[PDB]
Amino acid sequence: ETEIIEGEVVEIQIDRSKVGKLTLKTTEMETIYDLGTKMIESLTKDKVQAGDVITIDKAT
């Protein structure tokens, strides 16, 4: 079994350790998440942009 995120990204924010935030959407719901450090490294590495559709292996 796996915990998986999948959705369209609607907003992504970063600061000058670092703390950022993003919002995701499906056809049926929305959420905002606060990001820990290791996700900030992953999201900044892969140049995610608003309107992208993405899937995340939560555990990894």
Partner 1 sequence: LDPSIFESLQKERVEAGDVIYIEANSGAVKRQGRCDTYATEFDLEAEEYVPLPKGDV
Partner 2 sequence: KDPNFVHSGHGGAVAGKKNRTWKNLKQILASERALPWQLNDPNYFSIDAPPSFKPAKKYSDVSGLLANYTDPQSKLRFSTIEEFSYIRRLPSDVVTGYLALRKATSI
Which residues fall within 8 angstroms of residue 59, CB to CB, at 6 or more apart?
2, 3
Q: Could you tell which of partner 2, partner 1, none binds residue 39, using a CB distance below 5 to 8 A set by kind?
A: partner 1
Per the CB < 8 A criterion, the answer to whether 20 and 37 are in contact is no
Q: Site for partner 2 (CB under 8 A): which residue of 28, 45, 47, 59?
A: 28
Report if residue 1 touches partner 2, rule: CB under 8 A: no
Q: How far apart are the first and last CA of the chain?
A: 14
Q: Could you tell which of partner 2, partner 1, none binds residue 14, using a CB distance below 5 to 8 A set by kind?
A: none
**Minimum Å distance from CB 8 to partner 2?**
13
